[PDB]
Ligand binder design. Sequence first.
Ligand code: FXW
Ligand code: CL
Ligand code: CL
Ligand code: CL
Ligand code: CL
Ligand code: CL
Ligand code: CL
Lengths: 261, 259
Amino acid sequence: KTVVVTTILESPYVMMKKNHEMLEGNERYEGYCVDLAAEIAKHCGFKYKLTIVGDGKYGARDADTKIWNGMVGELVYGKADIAIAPLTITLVREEVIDFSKPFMSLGISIMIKKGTPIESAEDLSKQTEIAYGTLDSGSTKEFFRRSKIAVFDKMWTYMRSAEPSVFVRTTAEGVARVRKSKGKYAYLLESTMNEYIEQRKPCDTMKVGGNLDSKGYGIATPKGSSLGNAVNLAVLKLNEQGLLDKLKNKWWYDKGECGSG
Amino acid sequence: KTVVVTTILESPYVMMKKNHEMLEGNERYEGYCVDLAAEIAKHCGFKYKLTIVGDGKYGARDADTKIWNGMVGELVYGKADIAIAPLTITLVREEVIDFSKPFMSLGISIMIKKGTPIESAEDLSKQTEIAYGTLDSGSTKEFFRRSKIAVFDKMWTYMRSAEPSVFVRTTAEGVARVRKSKGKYAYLLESTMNEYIEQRKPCDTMKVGGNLDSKGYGIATPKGSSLGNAVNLAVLKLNEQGLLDKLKNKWWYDKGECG
Ligand SMILES: O=S1(=O)NCN(C2CC2)c2cc(CCc3ccc4c(c3)N(C3CC3)CNS4(=O)=O)ccc21
Ligand SMILES: [Cl-]
Ligand SMILES: [Cl-]
Ligand SMILES: [Cl-]
Ligand SMILES: [Cl-]
Ligand SMILES: [Cl-]
Ligand SMILES: [Cl-]
C-alpha cells in the first residue's frame, strides 16, 4: 500500500542528487517538495514512492484530443495517487482533481537585470526603450491578453505587436534574455521563480514591484481519493507550525548564492 | 429554499448602508463580502438572504463545552447554509466545515501612528520605547507565543511580560490605542485591516514592513453541502477573471479617504 507520488524535476522543488545512481528510492531526490512530501506523508500516515512525471509536464487538457498531460493526466488516468509539486491551483484543474489548500503563494512579477530603471509594471507600460515579454504560451501571456486593467492592457497592446518578438519559448530563455540584453529586456514570470533566480549566481537579476495577480501551488489528489481530506489538513497544520515558511527560506535563501541586500 | 448566508458586520466587508433603516433585506448592506455574495450566488445559481451572525463572532470551539460559536457554529448546527465573511482559513475550522479556496490574502503586519520611527518587526524587537502588542486571544498572539524565529521569539518575550499590558481585547481597541498613544504604541494585526484603516480618516496610521505570515479568508459551508464544490470553483473563476482584485481595490482604495 505504497502511495505513488508524481512530481516534476524543477529546481528547487525536486532535483536529482549528483550521486543519485548510488542511492535508492526517495533518497535519489532533494528539494522543497521532497521535504514537503515527507512532512505530508508523516502527518497522513502513509508510505510513498516519489516518481517523476513521465512527460515532464504540469497538466493541461489538449483541446483537440481532450487528453490531460502531465501530473494531472497521471492522476485522472490512474498512474499516480497524489501530485506533490509546484502545480498552480487553477479552475480547469480544480474541475478534475482535488487541490489541497495552497502550500506556497505566487504571482506574476518583473525580473530585471540589476540597474534597469524599472520599478513596476506601470513603469514598463509608460516607456519603450526597455522591451518586455512573457512565456510564449501559458497563463502569464493570457493574463495580459484578457486583462481589463489600463496598465496591463497597454502592456498587452505593446507585447502582442513588439518586434523582434518579446515572447520566449522557455523560462530559461526569458532569464537568459534578461541577463544578456544589457538591461534592454525585462521578463514577466512567477514570483517564486524570479525570487529563486535572484539568489542564483551570477546574482545579476532582481525582482521588482508587487505581484500582478495572486495564485498558489496546491497538492493534487483524484476525486474520491482516501488521501484528500488528510492531505488538506496536513498542509494547514504545516503552515500554522511555520514549516512552510521554514522550507521556503531553506531552499530559496539559506541555500542562496547572492547573500542579502 | 433561499440560501441563508451568515456574515459579520466588519468594515469594509459588510456594513450598514447609511440609510439602512429605510431599507429591507439584502439592500440594507454594502461592502466587499456583499458584492462577493452576489457574485457567488450568480455563479452558483442560487437565491440568498444575508444574515448577520447572532453572537457577532467568527468561529471558535469552547474547550469545555465543545460548542462552536460564531459563523462556524451557525454552519455546523444548521442555522445557516454558507458563511461569506473575512473568516480566516485555520486547521481547527477546516476539520469541521468546508473552506473554499481563499478569496483574499492576509498576514500579520504592523500598524503605527504616522511619525513613529518603526519600519519593521526587527525595528520593534530592538527597542522598548515604543510599546507593541496584539489581540489578547487568537492566532496573532499564538503566532508569537509559538515562534522559534529569533526576532519573533524576542518580541514574544517582551510582549508577554510588558507592563502595562500591550494586549487589547478587540481589534478596534488596538487601532484606537495606536491613534491615542501619541506615537508610543504599535499594533500587530492582519494586513487587510491595517491597509483599510490606513485609507480612513483621519489618515493618521501607516502599515509598515512585510507580512510576518501567510493566511487567507475562505468561504465556509457545512460538510456535505450541495453548494461546496460550486462555491469553490466560483472563487477560482472570480480570481482568474480579476474580479477579486477589482473588488478589493474598490472597497480599500477607490473608496479610500487618504489619497
Ligand atoms: O488560487 S487560490 O486558491 N485562490 C485565490 N487566491 C487569492 C487571494 C484571492 C490565493 C492566494 C494564495 C496566497 C494567499 C494564501 C491563502 C490561503 C492560504 C495560504 C496563502 N497558505 C500559505 C502557504 C502559502 C496556506 N494555506 S492557506 O491558509 O489555505 C494562495 C492560493 C490562492
Ligand atoms: Cl530545474
Ligand atoms: Cl539510498
Ligand atoms: Cl522611453
Ligand atoms: Cl484600470
Ligand atoms: Cl427583512
Ligand atoms: Cl532565526
